[PDB]
Ligand binder design. Structure first.
Ligand SMILES: C=C(C)[C@]12C[C@@H](C)[C@@]34O[C@](Cc5ccccc5)(O[C@@H]1[C@@H]3C=C(COC(=O)Cc1ccc(O)c(OC)c1)C[C@]1(O)C(=O)C(C)=C[C@@H]41)O2
Ligand SMILES: C=C(C)[C@]12C[C@@H](C)[C@@]34O[C@](Cc5ccccc5)(O[C@@H]1[C@@H]3C=C(COC(=O)Cc1ccc(O)c(OC)c1)C[C@]1(O)C(=O)C(C)=C[C@@H]41)O2
Ligand SMILES: C=C(C)[C@]12C[C@@H](C)[C@@]34O[C@](Cc5ccccc5)(O[C@@H]1[C@@H]3C=C(COC(=O)Cc1ccc(O)c(OC)c1)C[C@]1(O)C(=O)C(C)=C[C@@H]41)O2
Ligand code: NA
Ligand code: NA
Lengths: 532, 79, 80, 532, 67, 80
């Protein structure tokens, strides 16, 4: 449980610099791994994860003096690149202990900066941030994956002002004339890399990342996504929208002019209209097959966890279900069952409502579509359950009261009471009962209770309008557009290389060795009228 | 005075029971009016499902809103 | 968005209808628009098979339309 | 224009103490009246009113040293009780210059207190606050009339902690045991007096008083009104409500069973039902006459200015109009015109809606009734104008399009288009036209524009829901209840003296002379857990 | 204005608490497991020489300041 | 409904010798930024006559803070 803990860990925990100094002087092993269950993540038990090492323990506890001693003592220096059983180094541990609170973010940022400076000074040829843990994540990738927006924000626009540490910066100042200055953002492992770019990690999160909506608001990421949109993806997205418009028009035309004789499949007549009809049907089935395979590819690549399946990946599910209805329609069509129509129309309806998928790329319409999606996913079940409880209760009461009437059934009475909700309730739809007072009292009570329900729905949804819905929907729309951008880049359709944006600029030209550093920078201009 | 602002669900269940028992009495009294009682109980029997929305945060909150709407505000506007 | 929903469900319903009195985009679009103004018949035709499909489409259209209007209300309230 | 201005006024204006001292030493007249048009209220011209006297000029300009010198010089002491052409003294002038701002209220309060102390010291037998101006108003009554809530609030709970000034206080501390103490408020010229009590002045304001809603929130007034309600007026108000319920029930019964034969008046048949009917009719006419004379008495006593007529005095107008409809019905009845029914039903409808008058006395119901009243008075005309513009425009277009149809008239087409607002629009109500596309386009445009109008009405009214409507309606309800209390006290119905509340208590018993002062004080218990 | 949401949430919490207490009072099978949180020695130094077991509830917290 | 006094008592911790036993909140251990504390639960979970949970839950509705008293940390966590 406490396996691996030794006196050096105890000394660091108690914040006793003298005891740590004596223990290191007396031959304590500064690389000892406290790999007991207490020192692991272990969400189902109490504990504290810090990287299992004395150096990462000192770093995680905001003890800079002990870190400086351990790294560069006289007897046994600590290995700044050491990895624990998970593969995490000190920087990975510092990312892990972040929780996006103010003081935690401040001290974690400061400790991260100090670790980088000391590592560069002691080991100029060591690139700490390129070291990956057993999951293959760098500290930047780990911060992006875990949603540590504070540490991510610090790293992305990190600028270090001192000699022999410029190469560690990721934000550079290219020039400054007056109040205007032009800065450069590094974008290594953000735009693209071998395994885990920041954009890929954020966009393809599992929806359990706490700040997936907010991480994209960090300046270089938002500007990079807007640039990618305007330069490369806008035209391709509009072309896809146009093609989908043509597909849905052809599907609507083919379905509208279906033959009405029974027993499909139908013989092709030697006439122009039927050649157009069968061509449209073939194109409709082809598009359905295309969306079917696209949905399968998406689900295989992402592997949703059946809870992230719906709160994310919503549009992919809708397109896949549309294709499923299309394929079931084809199977029923060739099975000589008229019921294929029942499938086809559903696909047709879905095929038009999925037009809302393309509202992303338009800020306001995309926000409205996001509101619709989240209302369906979050709020619909609660209100529909309560409304259906009231409807079914009063329908059962009324149909029990009715004796051998025209209605006298759950379906007819439920529909007739539902008509009150749409402003079409008759209120005298039958007289096949005794106790007219009971009938009218039940209907009036149902009407009043239904209006109470709808009024409470309105009030309850108004509780979230205090700046929450607008900003939340806007950020969700931005995330959806980012996902669209990344998918479009992955497809790219013509083996084009212009998707690699921001050009190849020289930051310093003086690395720790005599080589230069071209690092694919992105330029951002800013104006500051104070702090001259 | 605390009878309705608290203990609301207990009253609704008790009133459902009262309608059921009146229905039984009318049934064995050879009065068709028992149906008039029974249907009311039936209606209440379904709306009392809202009692079980507690244990679900959002649904329970919505049911609480309905309860307080009826108890607090309904009489003023209906008058 | 409203016209997208209206046209999609109109196309589905008119496709479902066979040789009816309505049986056209104009008539079905108008008849579904009547739901928005509180005049939707909900049984305006029987010239179809699969009554369950017809009623399911109409109920889904009604619920989605009320969701649209409610979200429109909330979105405009966001700026008040 | 500058008539009456002397060198002393100029010296005070320039804030030159030395020049004022020299001028008074050299025989300047400290009672000179600067009664030029520039120094009067004169809302249509520039100027500055200060009371026309050097003493009130110094007081209004926040120059306490000059006030002390003028009152306590050696050569010619200023007359602290002097009155200007309007009859205003220095205290009236200080009330006049108040505008309910923070700094103005602070310095006016301080100057008022200092002048009272100086007047008591120099003239212990002089009661400055009992001096009335030409309008008959004391400084307290003037503050209440003009809506100077800051000065009124200061005066009503004024307490002066020093010997030989206790008699000037209006708030007195009866006892204090621990954190709990009992205060006594004076009530002189608040509960009742000869000419202008504070309650009468506030309640019967012309609606131009800026703070008539807020002045009643000052502690002694709110407590006194609640006490008056609970002790005296609650039962009488409920009795009046019950009597009005009986009156409306009798009127409804008499109107419901009217005979259907033509040509009134109708012969009384020797049968029980007709005796009850004619008795109910006689009682209905008697009540109408009663409300008619009550309305005339109200309008004669108050004399509304035809702008305050509607924004205030709303319920009195509704009751008077009900009585007018009743009397017109009687005249038509005996004139052998069946049109009397047309009048009677309107009165009947109004007779029931005037039940809302009695929602005062119930906080929430009264607030809701106030919301209804203010929505009708303030907002209805704007939205009705815009809606009627749209309705009439589209009705004229549609009826012009219709050619020799069954509708083919402004009334029928306007009614059919109005039906869309209530969820009953046919949308195919006629086919007597050419250009069906034009007809349907006009109707759809009308529907969409009408929903836009209603939605913008909703948003515009929501624009004022940020704590304004609730608090404003609550304060208006409190004012209405105060008016009801005062009217009930004025009626009093049995020559009862119990309306004089709070009992006759001995506040100090040590006036400037050897007399003891009983001042009819109101007791309030307060608890303070700090400032031991 | 932020009032009805929080008020309804707190009322729901109170209603659930009432449900919990009623369920414990019923308990349906003469079960004793409803007495939770276990018997722990808090201090072990009472005013006399005895130790105190007080049936305590364990809660973990993290504070990144006041080291 | 004296929520202030209730909140003070329920999580009372006294840091001095010879008065530790009076504490109802006790710190079991503290490793680093994380620590584990113990709440007493005496007369809260159960007792002879009037437990805190029974008193709060079965109030007459005249208790001013019956809604808010359950938000005190040990009670909310215990109920969950
Ligand atoms: C959530 C699931 C996947 C869902 C899939 C189908 C069955 C759907 O019924 C629902 C259940 C339902 C039924 C009736 C009213 C509301 C909700 O809602 C959606 C789903 C509900 C929708 C709502 O419309 C939209 O969400 C459009 C849309 C918005 C945002 C998007 O990012 C999007 O990407 C495709 C699409 C429309 C239907 O697909 C449709 O057209 C038919 C015939 C039924 C609707 O199931
Ligand atoms: C408040 C009293 C006890 C009440 C009891 C009956 C008669 C009731 O009529 C009312 C009066 C009424 C009638 C019509 C419209 C609104 C209110 O409302 C409730 C009461 C009103 C309701 C409202 O539904 C609910 O409150 C469900 C509910 C919500 C929260 C809960 O904690 C709950 O616990 C059981 C139940 C439904 C009826 O019981 C019902 O189904 C019938 C036939 C009439 C409703 O009287
Ligand atoms: C403002 C004037 C005096 C008014 C007087 C009459 C004609 C009235 O029509 C109005 C015009 C009107 C017509 C139709 C809809 C709205 C407004 O509104 C009121 C006035 C409008 C009302 C509104 O109902 C109320 O104001 C009740 C009420 C609320 C608060 C009160 O303090 C109150 O004291 C009596 C009464 C009801 C009518 O009197 C009524 O019952 C009939 C037949 C027409 C209404 O004219
Ligand atoms: Na309607
Ligand atoms: Na309707």
């Amino acid at each position: 449980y406490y396996k691996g803990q030794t006196a050096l860990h105890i000394a660091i925990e108690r914040r006793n610099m003298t005891l740590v100094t004596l223990l290191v002087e007396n031959g304590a092993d500064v690389q000892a791994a406290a790999n007991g269950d207490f020192f692991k993540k272990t969400k189902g038990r109490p504990g504290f994860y810090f990287g299992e090492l004395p150096l990462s323990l000192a770093a995680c506890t905001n003890q800079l003096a002990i870190v400086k001693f351990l790294l560069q003592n006289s007897w046994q220096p600590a290995d700044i690149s050491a990895r624990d059983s998970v593969g995490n180094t000190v920087l990975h541990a510092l990312v892990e202990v972040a929780d996006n609170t103010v003081d935690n973010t401040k001290f974690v940022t400061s400790m991260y900066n100090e670790i980088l400076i000391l590592g560069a000074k002691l080991h100029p040829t060591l690139k700490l941030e390129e070291i990956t843990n057993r999951k293959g994540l760098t500290p930047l990738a780990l911060a992006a994956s875990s949603g540590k927006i504070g540490v991510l924000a610090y790293i992305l626009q990190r600028e270090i002002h001192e000699p022999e540490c410029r190469h560690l910066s990721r934000k550079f100042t290219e020039w400054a004339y007056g109040p205007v200055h032009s800065s450069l953002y590094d974008l290594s492992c953000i735009d693209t890399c071998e395994k885990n770019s920041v954009l890929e990690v954020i966009a393809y999160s599992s929806s359990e990342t706490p700040n997936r909506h907010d991480m994209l608001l960090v300046e270089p990421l938002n500007r990079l996504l807007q640039d990618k949109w305007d330069r490369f993806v806008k035209r391709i997205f509009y072309f896809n929208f146009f093609v989908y418009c043509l597909y849905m028009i052809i599907f609507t035309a083919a379905a509208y002019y279906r033959p009405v004789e029974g027993l499909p499949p139908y013989k092709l007549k030697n006439t122009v209209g039927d050649y157009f009809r069968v061509t449209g049907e073939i194109l409709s089935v082809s598009g359905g097959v295309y969306f079917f395979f696209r949905g399968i590819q998406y689900f295989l690549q992402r592997r949703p966890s059946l809870k992230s399946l719906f709160v994310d990946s919503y549009s992919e599910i809708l397109f896949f279900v549309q294709s499923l209805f299309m394929l079931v329609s084809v199977v029923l069509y060739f099975s000589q069952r008229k019921e294929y129509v029942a499938s086809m129309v559903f696909s047709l309806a879905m095929g038009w409502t999925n037009m809302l998928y393309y509202t992303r790329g338009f800020q306001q319409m995309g926000i409205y579509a996001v509101m619709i999606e989240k209302m369906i996913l979050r709020d619909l079940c609660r209100f529909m359950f309560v409304y259906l409880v009231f409807l079914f209760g009063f329908s059962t009461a009324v149909v029990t009261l009715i004796e051998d009437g025209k209605y006298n059934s759950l379906y007819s009475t439920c529909l007739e009471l539902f008509k009150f909700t749409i402003g079409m309730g008759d209120l005298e739809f039958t007289e096949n009962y005794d106790f007219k007072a009971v009938f009218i009292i039940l209907l009036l009570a149902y009407v009043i209770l239904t209006y109470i329900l709808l009024l409470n729905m309105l009030i309850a949804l108004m509780g979230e309008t205090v700046n929450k819905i607008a900003q939340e929907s806007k950020n969700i729309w931005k995330l959806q557009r980012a996902i669209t951008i990344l998918d479009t880049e992955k497809s790219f359709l013509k083996c084009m290389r212009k998707a690699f944006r921001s050009g190849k600029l020289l930051q310093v030209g003086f690395t720790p060795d005599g080589k230069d550093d071209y690092r694919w920078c992105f330029r951002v201009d800013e104006v500051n009228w104070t702090t001259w």
